[model samples]
Target chain A: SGFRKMAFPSGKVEGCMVQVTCGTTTLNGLWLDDVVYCPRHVICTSEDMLNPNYEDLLIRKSNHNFLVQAGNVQLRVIGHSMQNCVLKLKVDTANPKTPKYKFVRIQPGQTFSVLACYNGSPSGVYQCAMRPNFTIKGSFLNGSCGSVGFNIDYDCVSFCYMHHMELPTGVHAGTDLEGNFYGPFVDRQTAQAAGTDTTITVNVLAWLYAAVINGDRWFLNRFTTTLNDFNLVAMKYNYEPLTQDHVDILGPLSAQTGIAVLDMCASLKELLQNGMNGRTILGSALLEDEFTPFDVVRQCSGVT
Target chain B: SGFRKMAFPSGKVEGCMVQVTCGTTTLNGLWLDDVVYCPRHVICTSEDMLNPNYEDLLIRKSNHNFLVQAGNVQLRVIGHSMQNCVLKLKVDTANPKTPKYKFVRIQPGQTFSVLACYNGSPSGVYQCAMRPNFTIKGSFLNGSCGSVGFNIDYDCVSFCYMHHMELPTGVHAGTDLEGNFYGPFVDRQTAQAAGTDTTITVNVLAWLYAAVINGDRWFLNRFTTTLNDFNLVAMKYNYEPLTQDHVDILGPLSAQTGIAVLDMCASLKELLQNGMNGRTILGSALLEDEFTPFDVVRQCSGVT
Candidate 1:
């Protein structure tokens, strides 16, 4: 049916901590894999952090330096001082069926062309680097004679697109990381604050808005606190309403004029636009269109 | 029946200060992109270079700096001064159908583990970074206690293989890019060169080399330039019949060759013996061997 349901983190303590109440009390915090420390359900902390435990899940990072370059990458080493130095070109195409490297070596002053140019449309990033201690002398990052480097933009027929799944891992959408949106609706204020996410699709926006309007407090609470763990919008707003000073501080957001709906219209309109580059626009209405036609050649690179 | 034909550039300008006068306006060089300015190609300037009609084609490089790590990538931050900083993680699995991101956040000295481990293979590199004013501070690039980064090589059960299609984009093959033979030439130089490439198994090598030897000059010409582009042997020699005087100059290539061949034979023998990283070797001869197999499991990553 609706994919996997999300799960929320328990505010339980893994171990415990001690302090001096008055001068003899104690304290304890929960750890997300011994790395992140959450003090209470309200917020998490590690050393100087106040609420470090903001997100429910955590992904770890390892220590290594690598570079990923797409298109026709070239490795050219210059300068007379560069002799007998060996450079190893390692490529990770990110092709799961094939996640590997093509090992090749080049010495000083030689330009080796990587990958190849096809008729068009065959492009992906290839990772490359120098083995440890291989100092790439003679200004490799762009200098006068044009440091041994190159830059490219979507050529003649390319276009742009992105995925906004609010995944639990990392993503490389469109051409850059700027487009990745990790939804974070952990509590009430954060959830009510979600009205600003204009990039969500129309259906998702409408569906969530309806949940609040129709008073599906059960469904809303279920998702906001637990079941909707990975869903972007669910995480974008805390579904429960708030009451302060005899007024609903954050409840059926529709009360705020055409705001939510109007804001959501922006998302819907975003989808219906000319679609980043001028190639083609396939919006909401034609979901069931069989063999509908549009741009046959979309070879330009990157955004509009 | 040939695929797309090969094309080469005309080399007329870029070097001579001495002018040959005919409607004489002295000129000097040819550049192919911004890197290759041919003094004579008339159309070789920055205006043209503005497009430069580069690389035979160009693929844009995105400005987002992302990191891809295996064993499930993680993001950790240190220092109490960090707050409200947004971090985005993106991934390009190379599967166009699935390109999106997983978003999360962390504070000083905290590490988040990305994905759960399983026996099956589900590999992809996730691009991650901080947003807006969060410009990652604190020696992220290999320094000190060495902040978080990761690199992987031939993890667990992955195997390696490559397509020596003499792909137009580039040919990382046994023959020259000009001699770019898309060989699966099975039996029988042409066969051996074809034989040299074993991934596709059959028909390619023999078929292509035979195309060369039987005076299938059309196929030959289809992949060459001015009767001389980069035809491995043809380039090894110089595109024509040799004279005794010329032989003295470029001759006794035997002194150079049988030696190179012998040296190559050592390489070939090494291949025939070890095969690539202990995988099965379907070498020269025995086109009929039945069930002789090995490599219960391959540990190498990607192409051979």
Candidate 2:
């Protein structure tokens, strides 16, 4: 019995993080119309989200007043927010001829620097005050006016934490590798007939990078062990028979020292471009069974 | 005028994404007793937010009924939510002795897999019906016993997007890098001191990984140049004269390729370790003559 196709697909697909493609009765066309789906048995893993917006969160801590000092500058302050607001720093600390005025608007969690006061130079005995564009009330014995409040040292600065919006890593908002909540899909059949020789590649280089840097055998094991089955499905091959011995010796050595003992990067590149045979040929001379991790790292460095 | 210090440091120091230390009237101990504070031009950079919660949003595009199929089993469904809900998949595709019956409770935004219908396996002609603890009106062409709407296929599924709370990458809420609004300050200071020497480290070995993979001489040039002044302030070497040559060679390489070539991870680790020297060395390694962009990144990353 066949399931009925919805005359109109209801769910949303656009703006989603992951996309999937389906080829069946329930999902006749790109099911969501906006999302991309995977075929019958395509195993999808984590992939990067596209067109991610980088937006920070608004952070605010309010008290009657506060003080922060660095270098010549000091801030006798009151609250900060993520919203648009301004703090005008008017100081008489400049040359008496031209009592100066400056301003620093606090971002939600942004740490305000006093060295930024008086253009990184403070002088004179000055009292300061602040007024925000919005309704946050406060005064200023703001910085560079040494006698006004606390005076911080040159290498020290004030800090505040902030928050923002980001597309959470991994699966979020109906998106993942291969299937995009975005759009565009081709039936596996479409790809099968018209253009038979289209090849796709996914690199697993981060594996080796993490392994050598972290010096964890378990981490290396995860990589070396999973590839066999992974290669069987897709066009991939990182055939390195692994054992506990490899992990025990190489793990600690790389962790303590920054040695890239294996020429894996080069092998990977050759494998990607010229396939397994090409990589095997290169490996014979370039990759030795024994070496330091840093050597591997440097060897990869010279790969290009 | 000195700011007042609270006899009792009353606010949380750790768990907040932000780290602040203040010395002022309200902040006599750590300025924002109600708020968090910190003082130090400590090397701050974009480090991963801690204890991030993985929460996915609940999404729904409502309709009266739906159909989903993935190999063997099929689901003719009405609705799913955070309540006592039930969907029964009755199939006639099995042995004549047994008409199969299965059930599933639904949650918002979660995917429904067909293999789930009968312990991941179903057979023959099977129609389904759903019954919820709460009453929902529906028809029999439902799924099982022929009256239910439609029966789905072998090896296919439907999915929905979900949402949750997390540390927004760059910033979110009032927490980040050094400050976490969730805990006491000492935990931060602890992660602060021992792991303290624990100073946070965010490595970008991708730089070199990118370079070698890209095979661009210019990429190396940029890496090799731009370090003199960076080392000048702290304890750093690699004072190769920085210039346009390095940029012209290495600059275009990264954008054109996805190779992590710079090995900035090593320098970053050193900079964080040596504090001034580690940073200066890293800076010498990172800062360049014709560089404008990366400087901005390193600058913001250093805000922690």
Candidate 3:
């Protein structure tokens, strides 16, 4: 069953907002015309309610909040009771920081959606403006009808940011062998897919680097981290990867670091895939600091 | 500061016990004289309190409940106030299911401790009988004195039971290189020591086998499972272990089964360590009724 519609006061309800309290925290509900919706409550007219033909409406709307971060883009559809509603989205691809408005409209039995994308720059902020005009028997309602405006926010710092936005916390970011992203995930399919995306691969490597540095056995054990993927990312970023011979020297240190033997083995395999002769992986100056593991990962990820 | 002793009637108190309600569950508190103690509440005489010099008294008593199951043993010390009190603990090495009584005494500034061991048998039920002789100026009291009795319950089924009793839920069983058992645990020291105890090794292996069979990626990732240890346990139990060739064939199956490739590699390594030519591991048949992986583990563990 779809969401039930609720009655609202007739005439234009100006500056209307609904406040919801959860535990000690209070949140402002999303307002669309006369309806107010939050994670816990949804109030709208029956005609505006998501119908069986548009099952994805609920999912898309639920996902809207998460995409308000940088580099993430999504196409959003707005449901309304009016016969026609003008919708406008603002985006600036050249200088994503700056925004401009583009207009569109919704008709009877027709859908209105917009994609917020900032080409070349992933870190961009966008906005949306909506104006709904009510009509009875094909005649427009009298008096002034106000507009509702909101912003779409997103920013990119590192590859990890993408994962943080895309997945819930504590879940590993993953891609399918077909390059479709999913998770926190595991298994061979997800694992093989994990290295397919250049950004996701770098993010995973960064996560692994953080785990190794902190001696986080739990983190290392939960996901598969391979040397080949690390090398692939490193090579793509112009950094020399580790070699098989180097992995042999690092294997014993795995025990010293309290990492699982299996994980260490995997890490070694990863290093071997990325390794090259006369080029150090962990660092250039024998653990000092020419291009330390941290430097290598930072350089590869292009994020601090 | 120590626990405060509660006041009670100055006369003889019989059949005194305290009941505590936690959520929907009610638990009977341990009755000692006129006082009651539970995980949440402790009402006893201050003199019976754990002193600075006897810091371990609390830990020993807290651990008493867990040892009530079979195969595990502990030395328990009972604290009482009267200058001299009779204490008894019962244990039977022969036909451990059968129980009897043995007596001892407590003195001023002296401890009353007993070891509940069933000699060669690990599964046994033990009992304790207490009769506190109240005295004034070293003279016996006039009124009738009461006695308290209780049973220590424990049983043996499989090695996993030992782990279940010793650690909190979701923790892995582990040992130190020095042969000291501790966990839920991780790291090289714990990993190397993991195979030192025959019981713990079997328990860990059983856990892994269960994980593999169930496609439990979370469990496999959280702990280390080695092939060499599996082989050692298998050899000690006279069961043929897995081999390198078998591992090679099984490696690709990891993908199909939704297991991590690295874990598959580790599993393969474990098979190789326990492998023997002509004597098949993972059961005698090739995926048929002949000794299956479950059967090998069950037989090796000596538990159904």
Candidate 4:
């Protein structure tokens, strides 16, 4: 036990004066323990920030920059592994000027059969960028084309699910830092029984598609700090809700309650990787009975 | 949760000629989480050969090799910060080829100086090895000295303390990392009340001295896993009956009780700067109860 918060100068004190006394009051919660800083901590914004801005700010479920007049845009992500395949859709346009694009999480031995949709913009041209996840150990292939030749094929397209991810962090370190908690720990048995996390990926894309289909930014409103920390950001979804207060202070991100399931499913999706992937699912899947029961045929990469 | 004592090549697969199979029936305890090479969890060692030399292997309570033979050699270790001194001495002129030295722990701090009588040879020496029982961050000077200097030392000469230690690992990566425990998180007031770690240094030196004087090496007997990891050689002293296996194993290092504190002190004594002199007291006037309560000089080192 250190002396109870003895007032000390903050930062590297070379005896500088304008001192900010260190305080003892600490926020009550688990201290963030990751030694590495790839994924940063999320802080709630303190004020009404504009310019689609906050410095390195996170997107909150509620106060996130809202483009209310925007229509739905379907972005297709068809993922395929040697044994299976999936194709899903999500919102891609980020207020056009703010420069935001959507992406899908891919796992090992899997590849995405990509596609995108922009509702009511039948005659317009748009650009797209594809950035892989952090554990994929691969480089980004930007400006990938997902041209869905102009047509009135409105209802819902079938293909969904992802097969590969690019954990750039992995390409360098080779392994998720030894003993890191979230991981691809499940064996082939678990993978088969669970039908792989690709199912959750399927669910997430579908939910994302529905959210944008209704033009509801409020889809994020369904996100929670707990849900985001354990299931979304740590899960495959790169951008999760930042603050609950943001929702209370501003309006909901969307009128979507089912969107929260997408958050939970994202976790189920990531856990499918085990320790090999930093984006692992934890909360519900660790239970023994929750597995897919290894009834499915198991095979290693490139196995005959 | 890996299967311990796994049975390999348990079954055969016909299609693949001589296909190897592996199996494990039952495990007695938690392997990875409970029993895997965790030094902190290692409690004691006994007759079973399962974990042969765990006691000598664990580095928890480490010693830097000292023996006790010719004790009662009145030695002194003087220094600018003699207040932070931990002096060790050993007796027996045990054979250098297969020598077993007994030790006595001593600190030149104050009232707690030690004088143990043994075989009178007082052969080897060691000084300021930062016996945790010794002061923290205490340093030793004068490196690498042979043990042949006892030829003419005016019978009872004054010795000084040394600081700084270089480990054999060439891997001197500041291997010894320690934090405090039941030990009060405070220190006594000293000449420089606003000092850093000085009080701790002072107290440990005296406490260590008392341990040596009483021939109780329990203070040094504790084991540390780091030492075992580095294969750093080291022991302690005691005053009790000799009939146990533990005593036999330590006989070469100590005496009836088998401790090596005395020898380490002797080595340290020899390594002190040549011709180092200090105050000779027939009886130390240092008082044990003279220390001021740490609270009296609180806020030293910028902490409570």
Candidate 5:
């Protein structure tokens, strides 16, 4: 049996990148945490000798560091220890700056976990560095050993690889179909629910935007925040209440429908193009002046 | 009309994170010279000046403070470009990390005549970012623009939903059948080439010791080696030459295999279950006795 819940009803520890490598796909420098776990699945229970008092942990406020904790977590498994689920683990890398990443495969039904073991509370949005060999990190932490559980089943293949898939016809406009495909989910229902043909997607596609307007939201504005390609895109999408202003472009959708039920169905651009920076719908550029805070990349990811 | 050439045919230049966001995607911090490029298509003559240099001109490494030549460029489709190419000319984040990026989209099937318009260095690695704020970038150098030509089409996809995808699994240790998969691009044609049932994975799955040795040589050591998660478990088969002298672990694959290619992989424990360390595989661990190398992440990933 399985139940879905956020990996950290609370949060996790923190860590950072203190070393660098020269090449990859084979070679990579590593970061040693305060502690190391075995290759075996060990109990990281709160009562375990290892379970550091997370609340008392110190959160590092360094730009070269990051914290690991899933915004939300869900799992489906046959074991109950998953909650008591703990294990000794390792983080590694094989160079990302160079042509060094090796691609491999996993059958179906397995689990992998990663964490930024930390303690303490120093708040304010920050960025974080993650996974060895891979570059996906976030900054601005508040505490420690913050974690995000990843118990995925390899029973399905939903990789729409089209983000930049080599399509013969090339991606066209109005075809922002995320526009094209959906997830690589083992839970067929969840995948289906998130697909183009499902009402769930529609609901989310719209409602997500609704949250955008409801004052300032975390996930909505600061969308998919990660360190991909050595850069972090931190944006905020504040839902704007519909006025005569929205009637112009949204006329078709609005005229046909009324004012967007929740500000969700207002535009497909935002949904199709999820990011920290808000999408510019139809080229008119209404919020063109909105403070889109961004900086070129200063930390050129060098090989370890 | 596409051409294939190695990166930094000359070698990497030197630089560092000068300001804030100089190199946003993939380390805008480095003012390195051997800029990267992606060959999207085929072309007749990639003569320099055949087109202007867009990426090169925008990025100038004078006295360090990298300046943005093409700040705030958008892909408004000015002229006919590639049919299948959608180039997003954003603020050259790589040029300098600052609130200097705008957006630009160049369609495929169209010639990059715009080279005549902005920054120079027409030819270099121009790829897409992985995060949501799907901004685009280009790398260039003086006179290099006109020198590069392509017959391919590449573009950026502004949509990615990691939250909706199924997670990964750990590896299987049945020797070659260990829960890993890969592509032996050069070897094992007879076994996989024409057969539908042939498992066409060209990876070597070995013990932690072997992984360390191979990983060290392949990545850490200046060798163009590769080993992906799935491929990590592709136990070594007969004929697979090894360099290390460590004892092998009892596994399925026989003599021909290169299990424990180096030694037993290694005793690895990471707080981050699946965190990416981004480094030269062996360097990380060797540099630090307690750290984990990227290659050693084999056990952390497998058939889910």
Candidate 6:
């Protein structure tokens, strides 16, 4: 609902004008606060400013470079209009002389899972570079290029290695964020012997309580988004799976702790999904479902 | 952390006793705060109370009945230790004399998706009754029913129906929580004609904003829990599917609004999964991931 109208000078040397004429104007433009502007120019008064001819020199100067580093990373092309736009990746940042990934033509919708090299010697670095494509013209009057724009989306997570240890009866394993493999020991005695009293335990209820108290959205998003990864680690080591009894007993604890972890997760996911769609502007009527203090698991706990 | 040593009397007339004697006690027990106790009696001093012999008269008196009414409902049997336990479902509560669904043998892990029958004449009523199984004995010393107990898990959603409208080229449809079929019309003109002036739109960002402000856990939980259902209705009428662009645009709104919807979702899911496991008592260290307000979608937004 941050709709506003304004006019400003076009960055192009031609000094062509630009303007956001009305609130309901539908244009393929860039978002600035609540206003929308032509991609190439900050302001425009004429519709011609929305799509202007581009010279090779101008197009070459418009380049966007991205360096992404994380334990886990994913890059996705959300939107594009230019024909010659290219996306290139560089994994071997340690050896700058080496050639990077091939220049791939930017498609309107594409996703790339960027992985770190895991050879005996590996480096966790990733780089992406993008160059927009524009219609080349000797003069601005020869021909006009349509609106040339693009959008990219990416995600990253903290790096953690899966660690496993042999036990008397089975294997114990979990994600080790630190290089040191702390004990998810079989018992207190084993933990004590290892000089680490930690056991591999997953207490989601407590975490949820903490999330509510601290407003930790990162933890909540990462937990659900990487659930499969977490499950693989937990299941590989034969951790005791959750049961209905566990849900019943721990669900009420949310009410006691003033947290509704279940609802928070669901709402956050919805918001994220909407963000992915490029629809940040929301209606007032649809805003009623925000977090409300209530016992999320009351029905499950047999509470009226 | 809540470990404590306690002893109390068994409820049986015999006055048998039970005790949580050690920190490493691993009995099939009930949780009280952080302590585990034998199910039948509050306190005990003797191990004999852990599995008391059940007389026919005592077994007949232990009954748990549940009345569930919602737009959608599901019930599941999480755990049980009794042999004669039974689960009965009654869908048509309007006629008290009507027979219910056949009594089902209580299974340790079973799920039931309870549905409200939409006959030409439909009523939304569901009832569940459970009776624990116990071993009968002529006397207390002859034999024992070892730890008779059971657990049930259920979920519910508010009532809503799918509403559709025929457009010039395609169909427009969505969920109608109220009886009135609002306009998810072809355009603003059509909406104005209907006098509702409301157009069907999904702005997850705004909803997320309201969620954080209102702390509405119910909306968040319902949104994700019923995603498939929502998608079915949304897709049936060809509403625009969320694209990576939409996700991109709205993802940053969370930060602008002091909300991290994605992380919130992930954390809540983890907490719920842990609750389902009955592992509410989390280790002190595992609670670190609780909600820490940061830009959850920073990476996705190309922000360092």
Among these predictions, the greatest lDDT belongs to 3
Candidate 1 has a DockQ of 0.01
Model 2: per-residue Cα lDDT at residue A206? 26
Q: Which lDDT tens digits does candidate 2 get at residues A167-224? A: 1110001111222211122212122111121121111232344334323222222122
* TM-score of the second chain of model 4 compared to its true counterpart: 0.16
DockQ per candidate:
0.01, 0.01, 0.01, 0.00, 0.01, 0.01
Candidate 3 lDDT, tens digit per residue, A1-304? 0000001110111112223222322223222322322221122222432222223333433322321112233323233221111111121222222222221222111111111111111110111111111110010011001111121111111110011011111112212112122333321222222222111222223334433553333323343445675466456643435455444533444444555434544553444354333332221111111112322232222221
Which candidate number has the best TM-score? 3
Runs in model 3 lying further than 4 Å from the true structure:
A1-52, A55-270, A274-304, B1-233, B236-270, B273-304
How would you encode candidate 1's per-residue C-alpha lDDT over A1-304 as one tens digit per residue?
0110001010011011111011111121111121211111112123313233323411111111111122233112121110011112223222122111122233211111111111111111111111111111111100011001111121111111111111111111011011111232221212122222122122233333333332222222211111222223323432212113112211233343233344433332342332223121111111111110110000010011
- Residue A49 in candidate 1 has what lDDT? 32
Model 4 residue B14 distance off true place after TM-score fit, in angstroms? 33
Provide the overall lDDT of each model, using Cα atoms, as 2-decimal numbers.
Answer: 0.18, 0.20, 0.24, 0.19, 0.19, 0.23
Which lDDT tens digits does candidate 5 get at residues A63-107?
122221111211111111111111112333311222111112211
Candidate 2 interface RMS: 29.7
Docking class of 2: incorrect
On residues B1-304, what C-alpha lDDT tens digit does candidate 3 reach at each position? 0000001110111112223222322222223322222221121223432222223332433322311112233323233221111111121222222222222222111111111111111111111111111110010011101111121111111110011011111112212112122332321212222122112222223334433543333323332345675466456644445455434543434444555444643543444344322232221111111222322232222221
- TM-score of candidate 5 against the unseen true structure: 0.20
lDDT of 5: 0.19
For residues A89-198, could you state the per-residue lDDT of candidate 6 as single tens digits? 22222322111112223311111111111111111111111101111100000001111111111111212222112232222221122212323222111321222221
Q: Any runs in candidate 2 off by more than 4 Å, and if so which? A: A1-205, A215-257, A261-304, B1-304
**What lDDT is obtained when candidate 3 is compared to the true structure?**
0.24
DockQ of 5: 0.01
- Select the stronger candidate by DockQ from 2 and 4: 2
For every model shown, what is its TM-score relative to the native structure? 0.15, 0.16, 0.22, 0.13, 0.20, 0.16
For B1-304, candidate 6 gives per-residue lDDT tens digits of 0110000101110111112111222112212112112222111224534343423323432222122222132222122222221112222223221111122233111111111111010111111111011111000000111122111111112122211122222222211222123232221114212222111112323333333432233323432423344344435433323334444555555566544544433334443334223122111111111111211121122111
Error of 6 at B9 (Å): 43
lDDT of 4 at A282: 14
For model 1, what is the alpha-carbon lDDT of residue B143? Answer: 9
